Design a protein around this ligand. Sequence first.
Ligand code: HEM
Ligand code: HEM
Ligand SMILES: Cc1cc(N)nc2cc(-c3cccc(CN)c3)ccc12
Ligand SMILES: Cc1cc(N)nc2cc(-c3cccc(CN)c3)ccc12
Ligand SMILES: C[C@H](O)[C@H](O)[C@H]1CNc2nc(N)[nH]c(=O)c2N1
Ligand SMILES: C[C@H](O)[C@H](O)[C@H]1CNc2nc(N)[nH]c(=O)c2N1
Ligand SMILES: [Gd]
Ligand SMILES: [Gd]
Ligand SMILES: [Zn+2]
Lengths: 403, 404
Amino acid sequence: KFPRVKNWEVGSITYDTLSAQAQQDGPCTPRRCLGSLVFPRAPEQLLSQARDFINQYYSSIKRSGSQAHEQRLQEVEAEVAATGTYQLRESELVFGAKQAWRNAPRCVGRIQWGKLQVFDARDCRSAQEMFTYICNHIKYATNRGNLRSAITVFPQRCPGRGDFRIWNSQLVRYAGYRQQDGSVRGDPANVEITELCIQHGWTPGNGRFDVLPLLLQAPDEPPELFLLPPELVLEVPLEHPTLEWFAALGLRWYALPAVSNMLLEIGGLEFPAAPFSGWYMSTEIGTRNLCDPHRYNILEDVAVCMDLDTRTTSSLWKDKAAVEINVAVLHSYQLAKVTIVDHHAATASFMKHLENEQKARGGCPADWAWIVPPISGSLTPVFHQEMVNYFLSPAFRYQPDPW
Amino acid sequence: FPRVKNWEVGSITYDTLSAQAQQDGPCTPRRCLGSLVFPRKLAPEQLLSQARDFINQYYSSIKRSGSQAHEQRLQEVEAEVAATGTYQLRESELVFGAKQAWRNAPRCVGRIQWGKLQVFDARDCRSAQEMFTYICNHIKYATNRGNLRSAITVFPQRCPGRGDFRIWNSQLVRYAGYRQQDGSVRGDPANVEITELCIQHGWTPGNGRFDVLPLLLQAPDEPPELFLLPPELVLEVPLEHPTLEWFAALGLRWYALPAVSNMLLEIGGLEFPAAPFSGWYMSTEIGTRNLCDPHRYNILEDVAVCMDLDTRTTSSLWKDKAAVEINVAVLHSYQLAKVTIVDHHAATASFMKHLENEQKARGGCPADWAWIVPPISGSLTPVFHQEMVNYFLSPAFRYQPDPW
Ligand code: HEM
Ligand code: HEM
Ligand SMILES: Cc1cc(N)nc2cc(-c3cccc(CN)c3)ccc12
Ligand SMILES: Cc1cc(N)nc2cc(-c3cccc(CN)c3)ccc12
Ligand SMILES: C[C@H](O)[C@H](O)[C@H]1CNc2nc(N)[nH]c(=O)c2N1
Ligand SMILES: C[C@H](O)[C@H](O)[C@H]1CNc2nc(N)[nH]c(=O)c2N1
Ligand SMILES: [Gd]
Ligand SMILES: [Gd]
Ligand SMILES: [Zn+2]
C-alpha cells in the first residue's frame, strides 16, 4: 500500500508512508502523469484543516493529548463558530511557517527548515507600514552578506476586507524594458512588472541591472510605489578567477532571493502576503538567470570570448561556457563574502534531509524535476534518488497575480 | 485534455492522444510517482479485444479501415484464437507493431527515427544455436562497419504450454564485472550478476575492465546455453581526447552498438519475451552515465586528477569540468572511428521536431521528462523547458521479470 522508493547509487529502499496523508490532490491520474507541468492549477472544511494543524503543532512539541491540546482544539472550534474564522497563536504561526517550508516539494534547501526567522506582521495596517516591515526583513536577511533565512507574515485573508499583496514576484528584481524590436533590455522575466511600475509613476532607467521599486497593496487600495534604499540591496559584480575579460561583460546579481508572491496556508488560514528568503544556489544565477535563452541569454557570447567553436554542437561549447559562468558566480559571491551554495553541496545536504525526514515522518514530498539541478544532474546524488511528489499542509501555494 | 506549455517559446498545445492511453501508470491524484524507474509491476476475451484494437490501429494507419480487407482480417483472427488459443501476426502487421512500440516508448529521445527500423522476423526459431545465428546477423547488419542502422529481431511469441525464448543478458554487448576480494568491482558493476551466471554456466572469466561477456541464450524449456561473440563482430571504440594526450592512456573504451535484449514486446495482445533492438548511442549515455555514474565505472575523480583540478572543494565545479571533457572525448573518439553517435544537443533538438510532428500526426506524444532531459546540461537543451505528458500506449516495449 505504500510506494517503494529506491536509491540507485547506494541500492537502498524505503517506503513513503507520509504520502498517504496527502491532504490535497495533484494533477496526475492512473491514465497520464503531469509531473512536469509548472502550474498544474466553509465552517466544517475550515475546522477539519484547523484541527489537523493544531494536531501537528502539539505533536511537534510532544504534548499530544494533553489538557493544553484539548483546550486549544475547543478554543478554535468556538472561535470558528462565532466569527467564521480564527487566529493563530504566535507559536503556532512560527511552527506553521517552518512546516510550510519543510513541505515544499520543489525546494532543495530544506535541510535548513528548522532555522527560519519568523517576523509577525499581522497587525500591519497600511502600505507604508508594509514597506517598513519589508525593509527590516531585507536588512535582517542580508546581514551584510551573511544570509539568514526569514519570512514576514502580513495579515491573513479575511471576509469584508481586501488582501495585502506584494505585486512583485521577488523583493529584489531587475527591470526588463520591452523594446520596439520585440527585444528586451534587462531581465525579460520582469517585463510585465516593469510595465506596471512605470504605469504607476516610476521613472524608469535604461540599464540591464536596474533594481525595480516595490508595488505594495494594502486592503482595498490601489498599489503604492516604494523605492528600495540602494544601501539595502546588496549586489555582487561578476568576475571570473582566471578569465579576466569576464569582468568587462559588466555582469552582476543581487545577494538575496526573496519570493514575495506566494500564498502561505496554515490550518485553513490564508496569508496572501508572506515574503520569504534564503540564499542562492549558484545554478539559479549562472545557468538559469544568465544562460536561459529567454533570460539574459549570455551563453553564446561567453563561448565566443572563450574562443570555442560555436559552429557545431559536438564541440560542447554550450556545456563549457555554462560551466565557466557558474564558476564565476561562485567565485564572485565568495569573493564578495555573500553566502551562496553550489549545486553539489546543496544536493548533498538534501540527501541528508531525506534521511532525516524518513526517520522523522516516514517520507518527504519531493518534485524530482525541480530538485535535480539544471546542469550536471546525474553528477549529483539526487539524480539517482527516486522521489514521491504530493501536497501537505501547511504549504506555500501559487496564486493569481493581483492585477 | 491536458494543456502543455513550452516555457522557452510560449507555445501551447493540447495532448488529445493521452485520452486513448491503454493501461494505467503509477500516479494518482494523491501522489506522483513519475520518477520511479520501475512501476511496482513486473482468457480468450482478453486476447481478442487487444487483437481487435491493434487490427483497427493498423488498417486505420493504412487508410483501409472498414474496408473489405479490414473485416476479413478481423474474422480471421477470431477463428485463429478459437482454434489455437492465440493467433499469428502478418509480416506487415509485425513491422507496423514494432515501429509503433518504438514510437510509443515514452523514455526514448531518439524517436525522430521511428519510421526507419529494420525488422528481422525470427519467429521460426527452434534452438539456441539458431537464436545465436539470428543475433549475430542482427549485430552485423546493425553495426554496418560503424554506419549504424536501427533494427529489431523478433523471436517466437510466448504461448501457453511451453517456456519462452529469453536472452539472459540485458544487452547483447556488455562488459564483465568481477567481484573483487576487497569488496570492490573490476569491470562494469551493473553486470556483476550476469557475469557470475556466465561463469556458473561454464564461461572462463577474463580479468580486464572491458571483457565482453558471452551470451546466455535460453530456448523453450531448456537451460541457458553459453555462446561467445566472435571478436570481429563486436565493434569497440578506444577513447581518446582531442587535446589531452594522457586521456588515451587511461585505457577507456566502449562499444558501438546499444542493443537491449531483456525487454518484452507486446503487439495486439501478443508478447515476445525475446525481441532485441538497437539504434546508436547518444554521447551522454556513454560519457556521463556509463563512465561517470558512482555505481558504474565511476571515473570522474580519475579524470579530474589528471586535469589537475582542485578536488578539495565542490565549488571549483571539478566534477562538471571533468564530465564535459569525458563527453568531449566520447564524441571525438566515435567521430574519429567513423562510428555513428549523436550529442545531446543535436538529439534533444530532433526530439522537439518529433514532438511537433507527432502533434500533427496523432495529437500528442507520450514522453517521460525525467528520461528525455539529458543528464548533463539539462536546461541548455530545449526539452528542459517543454512540458510533457507521460502515458502508456500499445504496442509497447515493457520491462519483464528476469528469467531466474
Ligand atoms: C536557505 C537556503 C535556500 C536554498 C539554497 C533554497 C533553494 C531553492 C531552489 C534551488 C529552489 C528551486 C527554485 C527554482 O529553480 O525556480 C527552491 C524552491 C522553493 N523554495 Fe527554497 N531555498 C532556500 C530557502 C527557502 C526558504 C527559507 C523558504 C521558505 C520559508 C523556501 C521555500 C521554497 C519554495 C516555496 C520553493 C518553490 C515552491 C514551488 O515553486 O511550488 N526556500 N528553493
Ligand atoms: C536510433 C537512435 C536512438 C537513440 C539516439 C536512442 C536514445 C535513447 C535514450 C537516450 C534513451 C534513454 C535510455 C537511458 O539512457 O536510460 C532511450 C530509451 C529507449 N529507447 Fe531509444 N534510442 C534510439 C533507438 C531506439 C530503437 C531502435 C528502439 C526500439 C525500436 C528504441 C526504444 C527505446 C526504449 C524502449 C527505451 C526505453 C529504455 C528503458 O526505459 O529501459 N530506441 N533511447
Ligand atoms: C527561498 C529561495 C531560495 C533560493 N535560493 N531560491 C528560491 C527560488 C524560488 C522560486 C520558486 C518558484 C519559482 C522560481 C522561479 N523559477 C523561483 C523560491 C524561493 C527560493
Ligand atoms: C535502443 C537504445 C538506444 C540508445 N542510445 N540507448 C538505449 C538505452 C536503453 C536503456 C534501457 C534500460 C536502461 C537504460 C539506462 N537506465 C537504458 C535501451 C535502448 C536504447
Ligand atoms: C518544463 C519543466 O518542468 C520546467 O521548465 C521546469 C523543470 N525543472 C525546473 N526546476 C527548477 N528548479 N526550476 C525551474 O524553473 C524548472 N523548470
Ligand atoms: C530516479 C530516476 O527516475 C532515475 O534515476 C532515472 C532518472 N532519469 C534517467 N534518464 C535516463 N535516460 N536514464 C536513466 O537511467 C535515468 N534514471
Ligand atoms: Gd587568464
Ligand atoms: Gd602532471
Ligand atoms: Zn505523475
